[PDB]
């Protein structure tokens, strides 16, 4: 409960939170073989 | 019940009284004769529709591409000038979108004297 | 009435719905149908997801596949059969969606712990190397590297860098890091049931030493794996500095993240007992310590296999040795006022937090002094917890919990006369205390054996019971929460989409900054029970 | 034809028939009902006396096939034009730009 | 406006069995019963309002506006409220059940105590594409009797005993059979805490002990709340998530019948309005329901509620389970038993009467006596032909044999009954779409049956005839199908309605 | 106006047969829509062509003919921000009505985004602008930009009438009368 | 799903007495729903006895429909079916 | 009902309905159990299937998936009786035409 508007800081931690989420969103080039074990897996990988 | 799309191609307003004058030419024809439940939209549309071009045309119509042809106001504008505010000044200014614009000083007032020439 | 209570919502969604709510805000759609699915089933496999949806078959599972393995949202193992072929199945992978509702906590942290600098370029840098680190999920050193602009400083930005890996937080990608508990266990406890050469068929109990010594072990090489190697980051190659490896990868990690929170809690409850110098003195001890202070991750091998009731606890006994060892032998001797941004020695400052124990700390060694983990939970569970109730209802119902917790399971004779004052406002608060749970009623008749009223009543235990609805507050929470602010968007998604293209009208500016400040507080509301939850997932 | 013999008992009457209603019609009433809401079971509505309980038609007899007359309409005049619609508006947008 | 209807012919497949979870109640509430007691009177005209019987809720008499609809008897059919009940108080029939998902979960941490591959392997097992009913009854039993043997708990740490359920309708788990004069990490603690309970009076222990723990409805009811998602499969419950998973077992909602389901019992030999059991029960409810909502923060004490509490699972279980029974019983005990003989009804527009012979009549011929001719109708839709014949039969008149006692016009009034009057200028119109009823004459079709049916042989059809005096005579021809002696025994007949099974019996029956 | 493309299944009696197929099933359309409102899609107008109509078939207690075909029929939108003639009927104080005759009374036009300067007055002024103003009778061009859809309570045989409601922004010059120009 | 050409067929070129029971039972109904009729009618009345004597002359414009286990579909025309 | 002083009707056996089921007669059994004696329309909606009054579904407001059809009194009721009990005696239905 309690809380109201305080910590200012915290308030930037929102800002910067909503400002990582959006770049996510936006955002879907290599990702390479990495860790890959299945070949079926891979080949789709590829593109 | 289903539908099989959202929407098929463009339909403008000018055969609609073309082709519900056949509805009209089917069942009583109305005015004429006069000497169910569909009259609830056929004295509708007829009345709306020609009074508006009174205070059509047939081959002129299919002639006025030619220069709406060469123009790049492409679909959403192309179909509703036929109608709504016809050739003077302030009147298009509305309809299309950013307007005036690139082109200004000559080749606008050619939509308004060929449109003009219409009646 | 008209539902809009919410009512209907509110009965069939306990967890659940919390794990695909997340990453719908993340990407939703397909995205949402996978997981919500790999948790009410459990353990999935690649085929059954086409079965049970009818989810546009293999355009989806594909796609969703290769981004929730980059994220690592799904947990991956694969092995065969007697029969033939191979096997591939899912599992909910740790929690990724919890990090993904951290996401800048997380970065807090790290700008914050980053000091002992002063107020640097650091700031804008890091910022914009952290927020590509969390979102690819996977960051290779080079490809990376090859991102930042050319004809500059390059090591401007490899400054930090070297500095990321630091001693917690950001480590490097190894092999099997992601994988069930108790498959790795399952897997590592082959070469053990395998090894034996027709040795003898005596003393049968001697394969539980075996195969349980030798486990244990190859368990610990293991997990020590990823916590510290100086191998790959501290490679210092000649016409440069210290350079990390070009060549392996990095990775975020729960090390000194859960940790930093911790101390918080360790902290507030410092801050309430003493002044706010003594919860520095101790803060500044905390810091150095905590790299080889397990802490949140205490049993490690508590997942994933049985304990006993005869072994139990020479298993745990077996961890509280080894958390006897460890905090005892390794951790700092004495130091005197090290650095810091009251002169001579400070430890008589540490002597009034030692002359005062109860409740928490002040364990000591001869010639060495510092505070345990194991013995420190149970008192920190029980203050955070007793403040819960403090905060939820008024003054009485908090007396009356501790009155239970003196004494045990005893009858309304001795309770009536030793609470506090009166007969029916303590029924009334009885009644809202075994309101919901936690001091259940107890099992016994007088003279009846079961039968009918007038029955001796007790009142007694169940601290895991008194735990877990602490565990229904983590979600419903931030349930309509999130989902009312996701609600609000869509609403206003026609004003949204306005805005982002002008990026006018008076009525338009106003609806502008209703949502705004709504979005703003409710983020902060987030946060907030975000950190009560954390002190609850343990013990 | 199961590979085994029974049957025509209440104990043996449940073998094949996986339909609840027809079962608790024969012999039973508490117990069906009961179980087949525990195991959550389905089936299906199919045969006869468990037709004429919804009040719906048969699958054998006189209601083995369906009656049916055709219209054999032309597949010529189907298909007419649309009127004055895909010569401006299309040609329009296509010229000089 | 008045938005288009379409509609297409529909069938049935199949069924499912399940719970609903206070979703669907809630949302079925029409009205809120609330109050208390009575019949929540109005002491004017003493009407009903609100509480168990109400306007809005379902109707008892002939006129009652609804309110929620209109057109009483003759359109509405039932609406739907709930209850609220002061704790989860336990359920009757699941009871059973509820036993065996209370055996293979942890008392430690409300979850399931199986380990790694025995969960692998049967997951694997009911996944297989084909199964009986027999295998769901196989490994839920197997699965149930596995979790017996296991004294050890997984993560969660320490253990408890089984459930034996000890007693109605009290659930005790006994942990009992510990090892051995082995001493347990919990029994330390467990002979621990009584050594401060003895100590202090240590007459009451010693003289009532070992009864172990029991279970509370509520605690059992929070015990549930935690397993969710996961494998409820292994516990028989399958989630596709319309409902809540199996916290539905426990009675917190309650579904208050509607009118339809019980009247207000009509009339007597004296003027009176008389309630039906099913009224009393519930309405009952509400009080005893009350009692423990009005006190809680104000009065009485901790021993006091309790078995009020406990009277409370006595009522519901009594409520849906002078038998005073309400419920259970109507559904299984609805004019019917199997003995390996049932009991049935319902055959409209028929007849009965005595056999007798005679030669004249040829086989597929059966004379119909004009008496019963006249009350016994059937339906006629007129056109294009019988305009001619049928608007004499109008005027002809409900007495002599060739006449109509009803009128039906394609407007769709009430009904028209000539009897009364009319007629005359009535038959001048008669338009196509209208339909009339004529009484029953030669050409026509109707089946001939005998109660005591024994093969294919009984049920026949045959013509039909208007001969005099009284009685149901058929050819000598046949006494064979039958069975008939004469000798006055009884005979049942039987006259279709529609075109379609008219044609279907003699064409084929015959 | 714009041609939607949908599929439904039609009931021919005995009475029609005496008639052609396609003149059966024209008749039978236009009883189902004409000036019914179709969900999502808009509102219909009348109907165009018909396609792909096949042999049609016959349940057991009946005898009539149930035929299952697909058709165009001819609906009503312009499109989101589309400019059309009409004019006011009706008001209070909330914003002017306005009414196209030939189709609908529905559109309405609430004063939020329209002229700075406009207010009702309970005086039977209708309105006013700091130019002049204008009432009913009087031919008013106004503009869409937003549309709502919503379902329908049950009928009751002898308020929230949504069923199709479109409302606009005229904000820009030129709008609601005619005679401002030339 | 697909209509089996007209060309082979496995099913007997017969009809049963079920069969016969539906077609008269019909096509009688829609006499009483006012349809026209294809077959010279003599004076008399009801739809059942102008039904037989309409199959007499194999005036009813119907085409029976069949359907197997598998889901061949079918299609039988009424007038060259032969008894 | 039954007896005289009320009304009169007669009985058809279970002993009795295999026979005109051993004729093979479906359309004889559909007029004579249902409209010759009870005849019933119930509203009923796809999702959640279950019975209602009019156009609401109740627990769901829609009005728009509510398919009004046809079924004995005797079913219904002895849903109504079910139904109260705990147990779940929902009904899907399909489209009996395209194809
Ligand atoms: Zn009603
Ligand atoms: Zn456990
Ligand atoms: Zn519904």
Request: proline share 9%; net charge positive; hydrophobic share 25%.
């Given at each position: 409960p309690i809380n109201g508007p305080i910590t200012n800081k915290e308030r930037s931690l929102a800002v910067k939170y909503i400002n990582f989420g959006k770049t996510v969103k936006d955002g879907p080039x290599x990702x390479x073989x990495x860790x890959x074990x299945x070949x079926x897996x891979x080949x789709x990988x590829x593109x | 019940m289903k539908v099989l799309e959202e929407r098929n191609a463009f339909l403008s307003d000018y055969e609609v009284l073309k082709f519900l004058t056949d509805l009209e030419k089917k069942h009583l024809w109305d005015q004429k004769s006069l000497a169910p439940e569909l009259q609830g939209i056929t004295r509708n549309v007829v009345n709306y529709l020609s009074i508006n071009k009174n205070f059509m045309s047939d081959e002129s119509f299919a002639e006025l591409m030619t220069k709406l042809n060469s123009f790049k106001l492409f679909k959403a504008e192309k179909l509703q000038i036929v109608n709504q505010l016809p050739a003077n000044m302030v009147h298009l200014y509305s309809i299309v979108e950013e307007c005036d614009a690139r082109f200004d000083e000559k080749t606008i007032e050619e939509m308004l004297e060929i449109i003009s020439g219409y009646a | 009435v008209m539902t809009i209570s919410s009512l209907e919502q509110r009965?069939?969604?306990?967890?659940?719905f919390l794990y695909k709510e997340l990453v719908k805000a993340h990407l939703g759609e397909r995205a949402a149908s996978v997981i919500g699915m790999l948790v009410a089933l459990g353990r999935l496999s690649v085929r059954e997801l086409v079965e049970k949806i009818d989810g546009m078959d293999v355009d989806s599972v594909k796609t969703t596949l290769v981004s929730l393995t980059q994220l690592r949202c799904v947990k991956y193992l694969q092995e065969t059969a007697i029969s033939g072929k191979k096997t591939t199945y899912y599992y909910y992978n740790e929690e990724g969606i919890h990090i993904l509702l951290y996401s800048g906590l997380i970065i807090d942290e790290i700008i914050t712990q980053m000091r002992v600098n002063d107020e640097e370029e650091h700031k804008q840098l890091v910022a914009e190397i952290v927020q590509n680190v969390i979102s690819l999920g996977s960051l290779t050193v080079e490809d990376y590297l090859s991102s930042v602009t050319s004809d500059s400083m390059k090591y401007t930005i490899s400054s930090l860098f070297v500095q990321l890996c630091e001693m917690g937080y950001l480590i490097q990608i190894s092999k099997l890091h992601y994988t069930p508990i108790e498959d790795l266990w399952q897997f590592l406890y082959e070469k053990h049931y395998?090894?034996?050469?027709?040795?003898?068929?005596?003393?049968?109990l001697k394969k539980r030493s075996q195969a349980k010594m030798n486990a244990k072990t190859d368990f610990a090489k293991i997990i020590n794996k990823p916590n510290e190697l100086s191998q790959i980051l501290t490679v210092d190659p000649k016409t440069s500095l210290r350079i990390v490896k070009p060549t392996v990868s990095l990775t975020i990690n729960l090390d000194r993240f859960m940790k930093g929170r911790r101390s918080k809690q360790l902290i507030n409850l410092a801050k309430t007992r003493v002044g706010s110098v003594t919860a520095q003195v101790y803060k500044i001890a905390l810091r150095l310590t905590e790299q080889k202070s397990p802490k949140i991750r205490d049993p490690l091998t508590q997942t994933g296999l049985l304990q006993d009731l005869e072994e139990a606890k020479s298993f745990q006994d077996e961890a509280e040795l080894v958390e006897e060892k460890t905090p005892g032998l390794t951790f700092n001797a004495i130091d005197l006022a090290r650095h810091l941004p009251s002169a001579s020695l400070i430890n008589s400052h540490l002597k009034i937090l030692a002359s005062s124990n109860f409740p928490f700390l002040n364990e000591t060694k001869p010639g060495v002094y510092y505070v345990p983990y194991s013995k420190l939970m149970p008192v920190l569970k029980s203050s955070v917890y007793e403040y819960v109730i403090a905060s939820t209802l008024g003054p009485s119902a908090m007396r009356l919990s501790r009155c239970i917790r003196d004494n045990k399971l005893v009858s309304e004779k001795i309770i009536n006369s030793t609470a506090l004052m009166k007969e029916k406002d303590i029924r009334s608060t009885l009644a809202s205390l075994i309101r919901y749970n936690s001091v259940e009623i107890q099992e016994v008749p007088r003279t009846a054996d079961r039968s009918a009223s007038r029955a001796v009543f007790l009142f007694r235990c169940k601290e895991t019971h008194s735990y877990n609805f602490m565990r229904q507050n983590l979600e419903w929470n931030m349930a309509n929460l999130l989902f009312k602010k996701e609600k609000l968007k869509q609403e206003n998604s026609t004003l949204l989409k306005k805005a982002n293209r002008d990026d006018l009208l008076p009525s338009e500016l106003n609806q502008l900054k209703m949502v705004n400040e709504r979005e703003l507080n409710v983020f902060a509301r987030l946060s907030r029970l975000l950190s009560l939850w954390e002190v609850f997932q343990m013990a | 034809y199961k590979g085994e013999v029974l049957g025509i008992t209440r104990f043996g009457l449940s073998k094949m028939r996986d339909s609840v209603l027809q079962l608790a019609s024969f012999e039973k009433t508490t117990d069906h009902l009961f179980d087949a809401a525990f195991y959550m079971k389905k089936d299906a509505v199919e045969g006869v006396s468990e037709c004429i309980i919804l009040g719906q038609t048969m699958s054998i007899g006189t209601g083995s096939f369906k009656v049916v007359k055709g219209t054999n309409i032309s597949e010529k005049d189907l298909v007419p034009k649309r009127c004055l619609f895909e010569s401006l508006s299309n040609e329009a947008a296509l010229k000089a730009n | 406006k008045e938005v288009v209807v379409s509609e297409t012919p529909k069938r049935i497949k199949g069924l499912e069995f399940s719970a609903l979870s206070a979703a669907d109640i809630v949302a079925q509430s029409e009205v809120e019963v609330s109050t208390r007691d009575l019949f929540d009177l109005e002491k004017d005209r003493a009407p009903k309002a609100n509480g168990a019987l109400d306007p809005k809720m379902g109707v008892s008499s002939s006129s009652l506006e609804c309110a929620t609809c209109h057109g009483n008897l003759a359109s509405c059919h039932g609406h739907f409220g709930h209850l609220k009940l002061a704790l989860p108080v336990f359920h009757i029939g699941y009871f059973k059940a509820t036993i065996q998902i209370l055996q293979g979960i942890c008392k430690n941490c409300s979850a399931i105590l199986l380990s790694e591959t025995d969960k692998r392997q049967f997951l694997h097992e009911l996944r297989r594409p084909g199964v009986d009913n027999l295998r769901r009854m196989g490994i839920l039993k197997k699965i149930l009797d596995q979790?017996?043997?296991?004294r050890r708990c997984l993560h969660c740490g320490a253990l408890n005993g089984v459930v034996k359920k000890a007693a109605a309708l009290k659930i005790i788990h006994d942990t009992f059979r510990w090892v051995g004069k082995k001493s347990a990490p919990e029994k330390d603690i467990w002979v621990g805490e009584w050594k401060e309970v003895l100590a202090h009076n240590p007459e009451l222990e010693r003289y009532v002990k070992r009864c172990m723990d029991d279970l509370n409805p509520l605690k059992t009811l929070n015990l549930f709340?935690?397993?969710?998602?996961?494998?409820?499969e292994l516990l028989g419950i399958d989630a596709t998530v319309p409902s809540g998973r199996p916290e539905t077992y426990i009675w917190r909602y309650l579904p208050a019948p509607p009118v339809c389901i019980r009247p207000s019992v009509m009339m007597q030999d004296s003027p009176a309005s008389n309630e039906d059991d099913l009224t009393v029960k519930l309405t009952e409810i509400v009080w005893t329901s009350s009692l423990i909502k009005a006190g809680l923060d104000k009065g009485i004490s901790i021993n006091n509620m309790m078995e009020h509490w406990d009277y409370l699972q006595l009522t519901v279980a009594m409520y849906i389970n002078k038998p005073i029974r309400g419920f259970c019983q109507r559904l299984k005990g609805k004019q019917g038993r199997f003995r390996g003989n049932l009991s049935g009804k319902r055959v409209d527009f028929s007849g009965r009467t005595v056999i007798s012979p005679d030669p004249n009549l040829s086989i597929d011929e059966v004379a119909v006596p004009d008496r019963v001719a006249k009350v016994l109708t059937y339906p006629e839709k007129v056109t294009r032909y019988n305009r001619h014949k049928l608007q004499e039969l109008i005027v002809n008149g409900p007495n002599v044999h060739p006449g109509a006692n009803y009128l039906l016009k394609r407007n769709e009034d009430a009904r028209r009954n000539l009897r009364y009057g009319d007629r005359m200028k009535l038959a001048k119109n008669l338009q196509i779409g209208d339909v009339v009823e004529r009484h029953l004459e030669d050409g026509d079709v109707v089946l001939f049956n005998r109660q005591p049916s024994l093969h294919r042989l009984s049920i026949l059809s045959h013509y039909a005839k208007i001969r005099p005096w009284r009685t149901f005579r058929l050819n000598e021809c046949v006494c064979t199908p039958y069975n008939a002696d004469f000798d006055g025994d009884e005979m049942n007949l039987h006259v279709p309605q529609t075109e379609e099974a008219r044609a279907e019996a003699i064409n084929l029956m015959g | 106006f714009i041609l939607s493309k949908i599929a439904d299944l039609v009931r021919i009696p005995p009475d029609q047969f005496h008639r052609d197929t396609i003149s059966a099933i024209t008749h039978q359309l236009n009883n189902k829509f004409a000036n019914k409102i179709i969900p999502n899609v808009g509102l219909c107008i009348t109907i165009y062509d018909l396609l792909t109509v096949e042999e049609g078939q016959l349940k057991p207690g009946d005898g009539s003919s149930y035929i299952n075909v697909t058709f165009r029929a001819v609906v009503f939108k312009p499109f989101l921000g589309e400019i059309v003639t009409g004019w006011i009927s009706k008001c209070t104080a909330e914003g002017i009505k306005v009414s196209l005759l030939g189709?609908?009374?529905?559109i309405f036009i609430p004063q939020n985004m329209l002229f700075e300067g406009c207010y009702y007055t309970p005086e039977e002024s209708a309105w006013i602008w700091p130019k002049l103003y204008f009432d009913v009778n009087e031919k008013i061009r106004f503009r869409i930009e937003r549309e709502v859809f919503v379902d329908v309570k049950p009928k009751s045989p002898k308020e929230k009438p949504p069923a199709y409601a479109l409302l606009g922004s005229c904000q820009t010059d030129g709008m609601g009368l005619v005679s401002w120009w030339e | 799903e697909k209509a089996i050409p007209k060309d082979q067929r496995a099913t007997t070129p017969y009809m049963t007495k079920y069969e016969r029971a539906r077609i008269l039972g019909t096509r009688a109904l829609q006499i009483s729903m006012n349809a026209p009729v294809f077959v010279d009618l003599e004076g008399e009345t009801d739809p059942l006895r102008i039904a037989m004597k309409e199959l007499a002359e194999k005036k009813i414009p119907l085409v029976i429909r069949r359907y197997l286990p598998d889901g061949s579909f079918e299609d039988w025309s009424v007038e060259e079916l032969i008894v | 009902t039954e007896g005289r002083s009320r009304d009169g009707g007669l009985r058809l056996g279970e002993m009795e309905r295999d026979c005109v089921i051993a004729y093979g007669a479906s359309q004889l059994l559909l007029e004579r159990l249902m409209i010759s004696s009870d005849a019933f329309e119930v509203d009923v909606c796809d999702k959640c299937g279950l019975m209602g009054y009019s156009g609401w579904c109740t627990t769901c407001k829609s009005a728009e998936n509510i398919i009004k059809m046809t079924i004995p009194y005797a079913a219904k009721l002895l849903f109504q009786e079910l139904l109260s009990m705990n147990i779940a005696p929902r009904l899907r239905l399909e489209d009996i035409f395209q194809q």
């Open positions: - | - | 009965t069939l969604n306990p967890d659940l395998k090894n034996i050469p027709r040795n003898s068929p005596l003393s049968d | - | 979790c017996k043997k296991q709340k935690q397993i969710k998602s996961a494998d409820c | 189709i609908f009374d529905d | - | -």
